[PDB]
Amino acid sequence: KLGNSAIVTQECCAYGEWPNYLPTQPETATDRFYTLKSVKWEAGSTGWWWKLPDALNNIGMFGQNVQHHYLYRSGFLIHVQCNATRFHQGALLVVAIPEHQRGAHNTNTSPGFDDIMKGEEGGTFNHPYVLDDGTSLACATIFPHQWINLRTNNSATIVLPWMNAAPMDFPLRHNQWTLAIIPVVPLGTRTMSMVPITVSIAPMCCEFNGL
Amino acid sequence: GVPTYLLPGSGQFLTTDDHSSAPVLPCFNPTPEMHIPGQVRNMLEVVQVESMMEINNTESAVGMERLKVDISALTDVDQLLFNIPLDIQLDGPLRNTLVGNISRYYTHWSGSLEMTFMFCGSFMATGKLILCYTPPGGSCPTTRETAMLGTHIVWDFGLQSSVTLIIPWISGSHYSTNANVGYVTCFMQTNLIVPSESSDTCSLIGFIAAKDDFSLRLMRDSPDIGIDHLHAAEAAY
Amino acid sequence: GVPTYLLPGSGQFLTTDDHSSAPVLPCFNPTPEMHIPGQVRNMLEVVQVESMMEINNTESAVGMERLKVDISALTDVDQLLFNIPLDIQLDGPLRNTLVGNISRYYTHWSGSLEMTFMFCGSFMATGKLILCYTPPGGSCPTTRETAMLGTHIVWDFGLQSSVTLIIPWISGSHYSTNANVGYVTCFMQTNLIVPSESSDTCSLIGFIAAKDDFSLRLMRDSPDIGIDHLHAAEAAY
Amino acid sequence: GVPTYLLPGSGQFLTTDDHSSAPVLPCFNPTPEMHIPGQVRNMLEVVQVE
Amino acid sequence: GVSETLVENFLSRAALVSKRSFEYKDDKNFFKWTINTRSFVQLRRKLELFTYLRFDAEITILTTVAVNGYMGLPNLTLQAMFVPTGALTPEKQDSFHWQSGSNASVFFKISDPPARMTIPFMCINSAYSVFYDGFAGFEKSGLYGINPADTIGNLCVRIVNEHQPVGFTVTVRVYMKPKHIKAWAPRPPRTLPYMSIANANYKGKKRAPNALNAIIGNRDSVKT
């Protein structure tokens, strides 16, 4: 439970690291679930990707601690929930890619500022089979990942530790992680369904230096 | 001083030698080791992670459609759905996995693989699948009744949603040559019973991870990568 | 005798190597170490000494006039006097100091600098100066009222004659490229109140010293020195 | 055997060097040191004489 | 090592990274090389299995010589000078910058064993960001994935001897070999062919294997 906004209930972690503080350390301002917009998962939906903390420069006391702090240091605690009934079938891969250097298809030109920086809007995979960077989705379970199989569960929980070689980073140009939700098995029902996928990001162990 | 004489093999650059050498910038203190999460000390931590097989391997399977095998209500009672040739050193479903991209950097692999299938249909979808493991050299089953020969399990995906199928020791390339190295075969047992509101075309996805006894040795370069000229050629010069 | 073989990298003159070598005049006793005062064992004793910044950096500032910023009775209540870009690796007020001529022999600098200003007006001169530190990437203040954003101090030079302004950790070249690396900004707060007998054009001088946590690493040659032919050329031959 | 590499300054004849060298007639016993009077161990015995 | 799957053994095979048959006669009289991971795609695909690395590269300059279509091969003197990410490179073959008292040259002859220096962990951060999801500097014009805390350095190599060296072409091979490798956060192995040495663009082959829409070669049916 994080912040005055009681949203979801957690205690799956990642990299064996529950976040601890390894100066401004927010614990009631930023440590709260910033629920994003719920994206409509249909039958022909390819994927979605949110680059953290680029998705949180806009929203909340974390967003004020980006515009008023030059260097940040934060781990995350993320929570994806896919509210579908007992007649929907489908499977998501909620994968959290560290340093997702995306690729541009078929050209020699690197991605620009308006292909990598989206923010709260998120984005969408174009070739999700190779994760938009030439690798493979079939091997993409080496990351911190979690399965939303709508037969079994409908929710996910990944913890994202501080993933930089640097001790602290500046937020408006670099993005550590990349939450990415790829429907492996596409959604099915006979009526032919816009099932929503709600993403709540909660920062953990925030530090901010340089007013 | 010290009377020394030169052995044969003196002055050679053997590429895989390991001697201490002259630092080009001594009295430099590099940046200390900040605790970065998720260290790999051994590539058998990378291999033992599960990863999706590509079990719908047909022609006209485009993109994401290749990972998942569709079963439906209009399949025969004991129609063969798929089979997985265990060519971890060659072409097949296992080539683009974690267990089969690290083991293409090696020559001899050996250990128990671990398959995990996961049904991805609706909550009401019931039926059974029989999952046969054919040991190498044996006969690939066609009838469901002659499929009872070695190890096989009847998997009811109405109750379970995921089964784990241990493949035993295989010992690898102990014989470059095409042969018969195992199969994992999955027939329909009953039918697909979905209600009138769920979609009648359900799907399976399959995973593979090596276990603790997996052992790779003798290192060679990967056959996967090659082909053409790259952009920014000579731009590092 | 001893069977030896030559490693690759044998017979090379690496310029930064450190082996004991053959003395050209052995059984020579050089002059003993008489205790000469003021030894430097570390260049961070040379850096941490304060030294004058050059904060009046304009055109038509000739010679000694460049070190001191003139304030006078005919300046606006909140007119900007100076700002100090913290380009310790580049051009600016900090280039000809002790902290910024040793740190041009290096590549990565990091630590708390320490600025010290010293008012050099008459004994009766009163007034206040507000001294803003703008952290890097931030906005350079123009109005005195929006100048209250980060660290800043109101310095009354009627009471004090010297203020100490710690600049915090900066970490240096962690990003050869122009950017925004800090500012120290000093506005008028009140006015300059000198009596009718003292001179109405007072002056400030500013100092900078690195603190104990200053750290330089990776050594390169200085960009400052170069250009032309020297006198007594070939007179050492 | 022993992995060695040649430093710069290898193969040079520096005239004022002092290493043990190869005797041209080993297993030769030279004449022992008969006590000859007036040894000079230091040239500051030669200088300090008037 | 204990196993041959250990990361120290998996990566520290000495790999060729540069090869410049530079012609010296009487800019083009020498070569430099930006030391980067992205040179030869056999080693590049192995270093891009990991996100963060920390390795002391050793560099083993092998210099050959060959007569063009005079019977003896001259024993020249060379200079492989490691310019880091700091001061300037020599603009000419005999400029002032070769005589720098800070760049650490090596002075090796052709008839010696191959020269060898060890460039240490050369970064600002605690690891090499192999993949960088950000932008350099401040502008929107900073290219994607180019971190200045990733360039190991430069390696300017020249022939020390003077001109009129007549048409014996000097082919210089340079072998990088990581040491003390500590590798963090592994990644999926790249399956599509490369486009540039700068970024991770993807095009695929025309048909399977290693194509965009099908990575494994197509069998006839699932019951094959």
Place this chain on the structure above:
Amino acid sequence: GVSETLVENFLSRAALVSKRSFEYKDDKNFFKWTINTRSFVQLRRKLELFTYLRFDAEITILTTVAVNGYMGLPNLTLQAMFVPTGALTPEKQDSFHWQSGSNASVFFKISDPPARMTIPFMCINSAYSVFYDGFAGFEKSGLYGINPADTIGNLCVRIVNEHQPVGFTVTVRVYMKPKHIKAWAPRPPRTLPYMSIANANYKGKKRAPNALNAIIGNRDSVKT
């Protein structure tokens, strides 16, 4: 070292100090060099950060050879002889003074590794007076700043072989590298360009930077 700011590490980079492509044929057949601090202004500006020094210079003679605009390069024998501040230098290339039983020659071949001797702390006083505020000797004609307790020595180098060596020009590089540096009383770094190798004259550039009346490049105003 413990830090890279330590004085032993700050100064002991090996720097080029002499380079004489002396032509030997059948005074001018050899070269000498007065060993002094004031040779190359990249190292000179670092030694003039301090007032008093105490360093064992090592000298690493690198000898090359090159054919002029005959296909093989001859492997000559050289002699780098350290004449201190005492007895006479050889006036010719084959005089009597090369055969001196007190000057400590080295006898190195071209095809060897580079020769290397270590000249110790060579002074009369307890330190090298880099800056000397006095006058030599007794007269008013003693020049300013020239201390006889500052010359390290001389370094006469010749080719040992006889004449008729035909037009292969011998370029000899000499690398000084201080050792065991003890440095006393630091100084302001010199900001104006040099005039001579003898004294500290100052002229400045024409305009800033590094000019007489303005050392930092002029910005437009103080509120820039």
